[PDB]
Structures are given as C-alpha cells and as structure tokens.
Write a protein that binds this ligand. Structure first.
Ligand SMILES: Cc1cc2nc3c(=O)[nH]c(=O)nc-3n(C[C@H](O)[C@H](O)[C@H](O)COP(=O)(O)OP(=O)(O)OC[C@H]3O[C@@H](n4cnc5c(N)ncnc54)[C@H](O)[C@@H]3O)c2cc1C
Ligand SMILES: NC(=O)C1=CN([C@@H]2O[C@H](COP(=O)(O)OP(=O)(O)OC[C@H]3O[C@@H](n4cnc5c(N)ncnc54)[C@H](OP(=O)(O)O)[C@@H]3O)[C@@H](O)[C@H]2O)C=CC1
Length: 429
C-alpha cells in the first residue's frame, strides 16, 4: 500500500496541467502521484480528433503530451521521474474511500493521500449503453482516449477508400466527418437535431457549415437516428439502419453522441449538482482536502453567477492550475483569487477554424463574409441580452481579431446597427 501527500486521480488534461503547476509551486520528490488507467503520461486530448488522424505527418505521442497544446513545455514521462512525481499508469481505481483517504485499484492495490484531486474527465456514450441492436459489431468506433484513436487509425487503413457513417452532430461529428473525408472515405453524417452543433450554432452559422461540408462531398442525413446495424459473418458492420426505415452502407461507423462526467466512484460521498461534483471557487468539494477539476466539476461561474459544468480543454487546464494554487495557498496560508472563467470554445476541420467567447444567450446578429465558397471565409456573430453583448463567435479570425471578440465577451459593451461593420465593433472596443 502506497502513501502520497498529493494524489491526482486521472492521467488526462487536468492531471497534467495540475502536475506542471505543482512543480511551479515547489512540489518535492516523493510527494505527488498521478494514477491513470491509461498507459501513457497526460496528453492534449484535442489532438486525437484532429492531427492524430492526418494521413501524413500525423500527431503521435510523445509529441502531444501536455503542455504543448497551450504553448507550454512538453512533460515527457522523464520529466515526471526527474521531479520525483510518480506516474502510476495502467492502473484503474475501482474503489475510492474518502473517509479513509484510500483508493483501491482493479488488481487489489491500495493508495493513500492527504490531498486528492479528482480529474477523471468524461465517459464516451456508446450505442451499446442503449442496448441498440448490433451495436457490438466490429468497426463501430468511439473516440475518447489514445487507445481509441489507434483503433480508428487502424480501421482507416484497413477500410481504405470505403464508406464511413458518422453518427452525431456535435463536436465529434463535425471533426470526425471532416477527418474521414480527408482520409478519402465516402462520408455520411447522421443526426436528429435540426442542424449541426444545435447547441452553440445559430441557424445562420449552422447553414454555413452544412453548406461547406456538402461542398466537400460529405452527405448529411438529418431528423433521424441509428436504430440498428447489420453485420457480416465476421461480426464486422456492413450497414446502419435508421429510424425512418432507410439504410446506409458502412465499412466504418464513428459515433459521437456525448460524454458524461465520470463521477460514480464518489456517488454519495460528495455533493453533486447539474450532473457533476459540486465545488467552490477553488475546486474544493464537500470533503475537505478533496478537489475536482475538468469536465467533472460543477463550479461557480462568477461572470454569470450560476453554477456550471464545462466540458472543454481550456477550462480543464485552468481549473487544474486553480486547484493546485488553492491547495498550496492553504499550506502557506496566504490567499487565492476565486476562479473567474471566461468560456472559450473552439473547433477546426478542413481549412476552417472558429472561436467563441462568453455566453450564448439573447438575440443574435450575424456579420461578415458567410460565403462557403469564399477563399478564406471570415464571419461572426454576436449574442445580445439586456442591451449588452454577452457572446461572440468568429470563423476565420486573425489573432488580433480573436483577441478583440474575447474582449467584447469579457467587457460586455452596450450596443444597434451593430450588424454594421460587425467585426470593426470588436476591433475598436
Ligand atoms: C477526442 C476529443 C477531442 C477534443 N477536442 C477538444 C477541442 O478541440 N477543444 C476543446 O475545448 N475541447 C476538446 N475536447 C474536450 C477536452 O479534451 C476535455 O474537456 C478535457 O480532456 C477534460 O480534461 P480532464 O482532465 O477533465 O479529462 P480527461 O483528459 O478525459 O482525463 C481523464 C483521465 O482520468 C482517467 N480515469 C478516469 N477514471 C479513472 C479511474 N477510475 N482510474 C484511473 N484513471 C481514470 C482517464 O483515463 C484519463 O487519463 C476534446 C475531447 C475529446 C475526447
Ligand atoms: N470542443 C471541441 O472542439 C471538441 C470537444 N469534444 C468533447 O468531447 C466530448 C464528446 O463529444 P461529442 O460526442 O461530440 O458530444 P456533444 O455533447 O458535443 O455532442 C453530441 C451530440 O449528439 C447528440 N445525440 C444524442 N444522442 C444522439 C443519438 N442517439 N444519435 C445521434 N446524435 C445524438 C447530442 O444531443 P443531446 O445534447 O441533445 O444529447 C449532441 O447534439 C464532449 O464533452 C465534447 O465537448 C470532442 C471533440 C472536439
């Protein structure tokens, strides 16, 4: 049975950014352990749906270990061993006893902490969770961790030039439809919502992306869901049966239908709200000396005075750093600013890339060049509530333009023929 002052449970984005901050804060060899079910040190998870899948010059570990995704030093396993931070890899915690401050692995092994950081991230929802007919067929694939990405890369080779069906119209759906098309697959997306990213995108924004994908040869089947799968004698998928009675042939099915916080180890033992582990502005839970960061946290979102949960990478890095600062700030009992988070979301596929800052509430205005056939499409949108801009989206912005929309979202300037030179409004704020 192993004993550590600090234990990070999970080997993902938040764990790695917590590790870096601990080292910034003077953590001594022997004090810190990270326990992960993955076989590799903490990595920038966003690469898995993007550069990992390029047919040439793909992203691969150890390339995309944290913290290179935010422009920081790369933490190789040797970085951890040189600082006496122990990585306990290929270790799944099946039991967490917060009363005893003891964690037990699948193999029976035991681990104690004084301070615990929960950074267990999110599940990937699978059609097998629903009991859907034939969802156990081979080449029905999900994407959450690097092992998943390796199976997908392998299938992309094995099914070269074939048919892919992408189930879901959120982030994974967007990114993976584009990745499979760039790998020379015939690609069809299927989803129930009225339009892609249903969610953040307005009808105007969604119509741009839909048209652009159509132009790239991606087929789009809306208003339905997969209700079953055909499979051959080998158990390999051959087709997707849709609710409406149609059937799509498929060599590979990629499914992106959401994720949920991985919190079941702590059911009962901590307060929960909005589907995650409730925290204060320092990421401390119900149980003292127990923190929760990343996707699992439901925390106070100061600029909108609501608790929220966020399932994106920027928040994972920043919440991790906050936690380590708060832990140490009690040790040298000084004082720590409360987390003040500006939501920042983003996605890229094909040659496109957008950013969104703030809160997508209120009435919307579109601005700029919305032509899917433009050489470099550049357009955006503002969200306006109570006379103020609360949210801002921009596709194709420069660094100064993205900085300017972020400042709009942060300052909430009052507004109305903002439709205007829309982007110039942000650029002069
Ligand atoms: C493929 C993909 C691409 C994405 N791209 C983007 C993007 O471009 N932009 C963006 O904003 N967001 C993106 N996201 C969201 C972003 O990656 C997450 O918000 C972020 O990874 C959360 O970090 P975390 O530390 O909370 O969770 P995670 O990084 O998922 O880390 C969880 C860790 O806990 C381990 N674990 C869980 N339970 C146990 C246990 N019982 N025992 C041991 N280990 C355990 C997991 O295996 C893992 O190592 C993406 C997500 C995915 C899956
Ligand atoms: N930020 C980024 O650039 C990226 C983020 N990610 C993250 O990874 C995680 C998983 O992503 P993703 O899977 O795209 O999840 P999302 O929650 O972003 O999107 C999933 C979509 O699938 C819909 N859906 C639900 N059930 C079905 C169904 N049966 N058939 C078809 N569609 C369905 C969901 O609807 P509903 O919400 O109504 O249930 C939702 O619109 C998320 O936490 C996400 O934030 C992943 C890749 C890129």
């Amino acid at each position: 049975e192993k004993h550590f002052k600090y234990v990070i449970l999970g080997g993902g984005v938040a764990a790695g950014y917590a590790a870096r901050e601990f080292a910034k804060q003077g953590v001594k060899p022997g004090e810190l352990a990270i326990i992960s079910k993955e076989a590799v040190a903490p990595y920038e998870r966003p690469a898995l749906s993007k550069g990992y899948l390029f047919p040439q010059n793909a992203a691969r570990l150890p390339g995309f270990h944290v913290c290179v995704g935010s422009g920081g030093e790369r933490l190789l396993p040797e970085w951890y061993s040189e600082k006496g931070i122990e990585l306990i890899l290929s270790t799944e915690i099946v039991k967490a006893d917060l009363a005893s401050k003891t964690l037990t692995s699948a193999v029976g092994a035991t681990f104690t902490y004084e301070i615990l950081i929960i950074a267990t991230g999110s599940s990937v929802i699978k059609l097998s969770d629903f009991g859907t007919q034939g969802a156990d067929s081979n080449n029905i694939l999900y994407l959450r961790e690097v092992d998943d990405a390796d199976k997908l890369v392998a299938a992309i080779q094995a099914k070269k030039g074939g048919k892919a069906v992408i189930v879901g119209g959120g982030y994974i759906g967007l990114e993976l439809s584009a990745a499979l098309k760039i790998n020379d697959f015939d690609v069809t997306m299927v989803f129930p919502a009225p339009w892609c990213m249903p969610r953040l995108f307005t009808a105007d924004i969604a119509a741009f992306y839909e048209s652009y994908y159509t132009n790239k040869g991606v087929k789009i089947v809306k208003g339905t869901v997969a209700v079953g799968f055909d499979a051959d004698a080998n158990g390999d998928v051959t087709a997707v049966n849709l609710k409406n009675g149609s059937v799509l042939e498929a060599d590979i099915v990629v499914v992106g239908v959401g994720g949920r916080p991985l919190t079941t180890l702590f059911k009962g033992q901590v307060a929960e709200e909005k589907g995650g582990i409730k925290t204060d502005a320092f990421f401390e839970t119900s149980v003292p000396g127990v923190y929760a960061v990343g996707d699992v946290a439901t925390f106070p979102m100061k600029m909108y005075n609501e608790l929220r949960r966020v399932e994106h990478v920027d928040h994972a890095r920043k919440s991790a750093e906050q936690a380590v600062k708060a832990i140490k700030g009690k040790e040298s009992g000084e004082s720590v600013v409360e987390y003040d988070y500006l939501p920042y979301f983003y996605s890229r596929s094909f040659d496109l890339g957008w950013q969104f800052y703030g809160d997508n509430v209120g009435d919307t205005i579109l601005f700029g060049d919305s032509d899917p056939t433009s050489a470099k499409p550049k357009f955006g949108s503002y969200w306006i509530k109570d006379g103020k801009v609360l949210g801002a989206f921009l596709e194709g912005g420069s660094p100064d333009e993205n900085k300017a929309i972020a400042k709009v979202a942060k300052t909430q300037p009052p507004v109305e023929e903002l439709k205007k030179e829309g982007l110039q409004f942000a650029s002069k704020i």
